Amino acid sequence: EEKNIVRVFRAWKTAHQLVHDRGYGVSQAELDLTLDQFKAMHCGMGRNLDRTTLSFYAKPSNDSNKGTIYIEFAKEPSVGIKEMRTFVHTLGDHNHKTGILIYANSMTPSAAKIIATVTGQFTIETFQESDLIVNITHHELVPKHILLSPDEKKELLDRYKLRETQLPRIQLADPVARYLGLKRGEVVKIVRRSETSGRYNSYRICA
DNA sequence: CACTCTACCGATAAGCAGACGTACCTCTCGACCCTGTGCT
């Protein structure tokens, strides 16, 4: 019982960090909470976690072009087509451009088909709770990934006289690509340490 | 308009087979059968 509560708290804080990293607005109070505060703000009198209140949303911080982002934790342990349609409806109602759905156990394939069905209208990204318990970008092995704006990508390609296919590649299913919400064609500048040069800048296109 | 019996395309793995293997060099030694048919 308590284990599920602490797991959902960890996933929820990780989702808040994920939102803040992508460039959306998350108040420092939200980032710097504690387990007890989460219990107070999301658990009932009987301490039973209330999955209705696990959803939140955020606004872009420095790029007003981006739409609002909406994050919801699946009420049912396994997401189905019914809940996928419900989530798409919720996204449409409030005009949320981006939507992240976090489920616990599994998600059906025909439910996944809905993501491609509405890709032209909304961008929907799915996470498993276990994929957000620990923030991977805080790992020592993970170097600093930074999304490049289209102007900076164009600058890089023109400087190296490159084609997008000639850059190193990063998979869309890459954990850090999913953490950063990378779409196909977007380039990430990765800053790394180096035994030889001290610091190194690699560039990977999402593909 | 609550149900529970079959249609579905899905995914699941399942057992399947098929596919691969250091470098360069020196030398020796062994290599079809079976039966028609003209010849004498």
Q: Are residues A127 and A165 located together in one domain of the fold?
A: no
Q: Are residues A130 and A107 located together in one domain of the fold?
A: yes
Instruction: Count Cα neighbours of A68 within 13 Å in the Cβ-side half-sphere.
Output: 13
A39, two tokens: 């219990």
User: What gap in Å lies between CA A173 and CA A118, rounded to an integer?
Assistant: 19
AA identity, residue A206: C
Residues 98-127 of chain A sitting with CB below 7 angstroms of strand B = 109-110
Strands A123-128 vs A98-103: parallel, antiparallel or unpaired:
parallel
How remote is the C-alpha of A75 from its chain's centroid?
A: 19
From the CA of A110 to the C1' of B8: give the distance in Å.
Answer: 13
Q: Are residues A129 and A155 located together in one domain of the fold?
A: no
Query: Do residues A70 and A99 lie in contact, with contact meaning Cβ atoms separated by under 8 Å?
Result: yes
Q: Are residues A1 and A100 located together in one domain of the fold?
A: yes
A70 φ, ψ (degrees, to nearest 5): -125, 130
- Integer angstrom CA distances of residue A38 from A13, A30, A50, A120, A128: 9, 10, 11, 35, 20
Last residue of a domain, one of A134, A167, A194: A134
Resolution of the experimentally solved model in angstroms: 2.7
Last residue of a domain, one of A84, A116, A134: A134
Helix (H, G, I), strand (E, B) or coil at A45: coil
Q: Are residues A87 and A164 located together in one domain of the fold?
A: no
Q: Are residues A69 and A112 located together in one domain of the fold?
A: yes
Q: Are residues A117 and A146 located together in one domain of the fold?
A: no
- Start-end of H helices in A43-160: 81-94, 109-117, 130-133, 150-160
Q: How many domains does chain A have?
A: 2
Strand B nucleotides below 7 A of a protein CB? 10-11
Work out whether the CA dihedral A84, A87, A89, A91 comes out positive or negative. Answer: negative
Q: How was this structure determined?
A: cryo-EM
Residue A44: partners with Cβ closer than 8 Å, 6 or more residues away: A50
Query: Do residues A23 and A63 lie in contact, with contact meaning Cβ atoms separated by under 8 Å?
Result: yes
User: What gap in Å lies between CA A189 and CA A151, rounded to an integer?
Assistant: 13
A146: domain CATH number is 3.90.940.20
In a 10 Å sphere around its CB, with 0-12 CB exposed, 13-18 middle and 19+ buried, how is residue A150 labelled?
Answer: exposed
- Integer angstrom CA distances of residue A170 from A61, A96, A111, A161, A178: 26, 27, 26, 20, 11
From the CA of A157 to the C1' of B21: give the distance in Å.
Answer: 43
Q: What is the DSSP string of A127-191?
A: EETHHHHS-GGGSSSS-EEEEPPHHHHHHHHHHHT--GGGS-EE-TT-HHHHHHT--TT-EEEEE
Q: Are residues A170 and A195 located together in one domain of the fold?
A: yes
In a 10 Å sphere around its CB, with 0-12 CB exposed, 13-18 middle and 19+ buried, how is residue A160 labelled?
Answer: exposed
At CA A97, angle to CA A105 and CA A134, rounded to 5?
A: 35
At CA A71, angle to CA A92 and CA A61, rounded to 5?
A: 90
User: What gap in Å lies between CA A190 and CA A198, rounded to an integer?
Assistant: 14
**Residue A143: domain span:** 135-207
Last residue of a domain, one of A134, A164, A184: A134
From the CA of A144 to the C1' of B38: give the distance in Å.
Answer: 96
From the CA of A139 to the C1' of B15: give the distance in Å.
Answer: 41
Q: Are residues A118 and A151 located together in one domain of the fold?
A: no
A85: domain CATH number is 3.40.1340.10
Per DSSP, what are the bridge partners of residue A127?
Answer: A102
Q: Are residues A119 and A139 located together in one domain of the fold?
A: no
Per DSSP, what are the bridge partners of residue A71?
Answer: A56, A100
Strands A69-73 vs A56-58: parallel, antiparallel or unpaired:
antiparallel
Q: Are residues A143 and A130 located together in one domain of the fold?
A: no
Q: Which nucleotide is nearest to A109 (CA to C1')?
A: B11
Q: Are residues A48 and A4 located together in one domain of the fold?
A: yes
